[PDB]
């Protein structure tokens, strides 16, 4: 019953000459919506590209198309002249960005997936693997005998799996000693209480 | 910035490859399949909560094709740079002998959006049981792709993600082995 809404790609302006293991030619278009404080402030950004170079961009903060390279001037001038075209692009903050936000809020914004925490040594350093969680806002802490160790933590960063889950490995550069008790602590919005996993020599 | 919903399209010549996909904070919501002309939800559950007419996405690719001709002419047929890919191979969960797992092949920071990817178990091409994502859009406006291969780990199996891209002279072989799991990281 909820329907996504597409943003129309606008035609460029006919205005150029001619010329000439095969060469390739790419054109990208990215209608992107940015959301702040939930759905309070919304920046729409109707961008047009050629290869990897940005050509022309509409900004909701600016209110008109403005060129990003000199080749985009013909297009920016052509589009701003259309009166009705600009209105839709200005109202896109509500027409399209906010609409598509509400359509998928259930399974995108409010998507929670429990991590799975795992502790093992290798290389003798200790690894805290945290796999398969959404979103990516996560904090990992290493405790050495009930004493947080903010020195020696090399985190691999957030690693995108591509299936709407992240993974990350936090390694602690500590001599395992003996009898010592290392603990990995994971705080994540999908949990009700901070997870902890211990490992003894 | 809390969240970003990108609707991304691209068109490539002479290959005549088109793409139309939505993005939410770096992961794909859905893409329209150009062959079958239907929406393809990256996670199947999504389709139970939302819908999208895929015929509207085709009209957008038509304009993309038009714009691409205009741009190509307006640049005296200036080509794209073959920007080589960046490839690492990692596993979904920390490898444990005889437990179901998945090998992930991360292809990153490349363009044009054209690549040949082939999994190799012990030097031989793996035919069935491979999944792959559409070309995901980066923010420096290159591309990124995911190729999956579920598997059952053992010490008698080595793997390789063979990535062929026009930015490269030879195919790129990233080797995975049970003994050397986290070495790359």
């Amino acid at each position, epitope marked *: 019953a909820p329907k996504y809404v597409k943003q129309n790609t606008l035609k460029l302006a006919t205005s150029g000459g001619s010329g000439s293991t095969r060469p390739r030619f790419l054109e990208q278009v990215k209608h992107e919506c940015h959301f702040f404080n939930g759905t309070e402030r919304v920046r729409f950004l109707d961008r047009y590209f050629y290869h990897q170079e940005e050509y022309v961009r509409f900004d909701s903060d600016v209110g008109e198309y403005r060129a990003v390279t000199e080749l985009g001037r013909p297009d920016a001038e052509y589009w701003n002249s259309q009166k009705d075209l600009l209105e839709q692009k200005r109202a896109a903050v509500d027409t399209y960005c906010r609409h598509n936000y509400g359509v998928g809020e259930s399974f995108t914004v409010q998507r929670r997936v429990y991590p799975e925490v795992t502790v093992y040594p290798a290389k003798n350093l200790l690894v805290c693997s945290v796999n398969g969680f959404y979103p990516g806002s996560i904090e990992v802490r290493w405790f050495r005998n009930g004493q947080e160790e903010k020195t020696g933590v090399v985190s691999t960063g957030l690693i995108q799996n591509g299936d709407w889950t992240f993974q990350t490995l936090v390694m602690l550069e500590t001599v395992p000693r003996s009898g010592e008790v290392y603990t990995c602590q994971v705080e994540h919005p999908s949990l009700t209480s901070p997870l902890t996993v211990e490992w003894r020599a | 910035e809390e969240h970003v919903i990108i609707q991304a399209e691209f068109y490539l010549n002479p290959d005549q490859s088109g793409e139309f996909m939505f993005d939410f904070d770096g992961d794909e919501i859905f893409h329209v399949d150009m062959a079958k002309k239907e929406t393809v939800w990256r996670l199947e559950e999504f389709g139970r909560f939302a819908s999208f007419e895929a015929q509207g996405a085709l009209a957008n690719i038509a304009v993309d094709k038009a714009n691409l001709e205009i741009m190509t002419k307006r640049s005296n047929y200036t080509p*794209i740079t073959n920007v080589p890919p960046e490839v690492t191979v990692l596993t979904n969960s920390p490898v444990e002998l005889r437990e179901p797992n998945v090998l992930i092949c991360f292809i990153d920071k490349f363009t044009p959006p054209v690549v040949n990817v082939t999994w190799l178990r012990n030097g031989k091409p793996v035919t069935t049981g491979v999944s792959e994502t559409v070309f995901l859009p980066r923010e420096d406006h290159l591309f990124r792709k995911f190729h999956y291969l579920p598997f059952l780990p053992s010490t008698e199996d080595v793997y390789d993600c063979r990535v062929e891209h026009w930015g490269l002279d030879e195919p790129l072989l990233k080797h995975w082995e049970f003994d050397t799991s986290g070495e790359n990281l």
Partner: antibody
Amino acid sequence: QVQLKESGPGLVAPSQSLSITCTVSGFSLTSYGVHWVRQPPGKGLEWLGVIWAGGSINYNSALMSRLSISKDNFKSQVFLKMSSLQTDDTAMYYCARAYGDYVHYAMDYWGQGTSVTASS
Amino acid sequence: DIQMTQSPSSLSASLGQRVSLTCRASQEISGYLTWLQQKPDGTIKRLVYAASTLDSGVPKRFSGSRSGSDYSLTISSLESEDFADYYCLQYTNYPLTFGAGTKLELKR
């Protein structure tokens, strides 16, 4: 995080050897390659060579094997040896990072630079 | 050895103004061109790679482009920090060759 820093002798007499090291942190020399670039005072930039992640080396032919670039992955530092130093070699030596083992991977992060003067 | 010749040698413009460097290749570098910035203290920061791929910590005013064998860096809305030495770089085949440079000066 990603850092490269050059270190070497300030003053090397002519007809001797110049050894500079490019200690790197933030990345692994097992996945990224390291280039060498020098800049004579006032003049432009000159590419010297590169040792890639897998150890394959490419030198600049003009340097007539007066160049020896080695790497020690485990200690995360690259090395540079200049032989038969002439007065022309007085310049500032840099190192830069590049992914993989192919020339078409652009360099990104550069070092701070080190000064080396060849005079008796 | 490929020859890289940069066109504006000592350009000097004002604040909030558009400039453009031109780097042209003797052979065909097939799009493998980077633009570097060298502040006077030696620091070398990369602006654009592979003809017109924008690096991460580079504003949108910097812009690479290509027409044939002509490569152009175009800095829009010139701001104070954007006044330094600029080199172009080819990396299609060994040896890597640099441009001559371009001293950019803030006219006040």
